[PDB]
Amino acid sequence: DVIIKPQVSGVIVNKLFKAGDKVKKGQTLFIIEQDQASKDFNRSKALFSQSAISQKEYDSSLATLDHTEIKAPFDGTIGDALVNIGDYVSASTTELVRVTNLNPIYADGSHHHHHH
Numbered sequence: 001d002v003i004i005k006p007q008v009s010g011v012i013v014n015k016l017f018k019a020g021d022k023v024k025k026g027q028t029l030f031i032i033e034q035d036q037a038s039k040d041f042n043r044s045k046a047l048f049s050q051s052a053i054s055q056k057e058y059d060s061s062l063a064t065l066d067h068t069e070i071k072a073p074f075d076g077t078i079g080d081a082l083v084n085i086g087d088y089v090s091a092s093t094t095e096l097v098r099v100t101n102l103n104p105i106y107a108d109g110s111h112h113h114h115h116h
């Protein structure tokens, strides 16, 4: 009784899942690219340990258009795909795929919390 939803709004990049297969708590299934990979989540392709990329005038293409992998909420069963790759999608509202079986598990800690 749960539906797989992303964390942002952008465009599908890929799908590492199957129709009628099982899922895992934190298992990648979908992917969406957006102009916002959080300020404390994405680790970016690489870093600047030193003068290896010359950030002084390095390229910007290597630091943008990040991607957000959509991992299942909890192990169980996954249905089919509603949309396809290369198709723009909205925030969590996008119910491309849904998960069935198992109980509704939840235990994250990224951001957007009002429990203090």
Ligand SMILES: *[C@@H]1O[C@H](C)[C@@H](NC(C)=O)[C@H](O[C@H]2O[C@H](CO)[C@H](O[C@H]3O[C@H](CO)[C@H](O[C@H]4O[C@H](CO)[C@H](O[C@H]5O[C@H](CO)[C@H](O[C@H]6O[C@H](CO)[C@H](O)[C@H](O)[C@H]6NC(C)=O)[C@H](O)[C@H]5NC(C)=O)[C@H](O[C@@H]5O[C@H](CO)[C@@H](O)[C@H](O)[C@H]5O)[C@H]4NC(C)=O)[C@H](O)[C@H]3NC(C)=O)[C@H](O)[C@H]2NC(C)=O)[C@H]1NC(C)=O
Pocket (backbone or CB within 6 Å): 037, 038, 039, 040, 041, 042, 043, 044, 045, 048, 062, 063, 064, 066
């Ligand atoms: C997603 O993909 C992208 C493609 C990728 N980007 C690119 C371009 O490819 C993204 O990576 C980028 O973004 C991430 C995070 O979003 C990473 O950047 C973070 O980490 C960096 C270090 O590696 C930087 O942080 C450093 O600089 C800041 C200031 O801007 C902080 O330092 C300040 O504060 C300190 C403590 O308060 C010091 O100040 C104290 O000492 C002085 C000395 O006199 C004074 O007395 C002060 O008054 C003191 N403080 C107090 C309170 O009294 C420090 O000197 C000061 N700097 C300045 C200039 O003033 C930071 O340290 C943290 O600071 C906070 C509060 O400031 C403190 O609470 C923490 O304890 C402390 O850790 C510095 N850290 C280091 C290790 O040097 C970035 O600014 C930081 N981001 C943010 C939002 O803060 C990544 O490296 C980025 N890459 C590039 C190329 O830019 C990628 N990921 C994400 C998440 O987007």
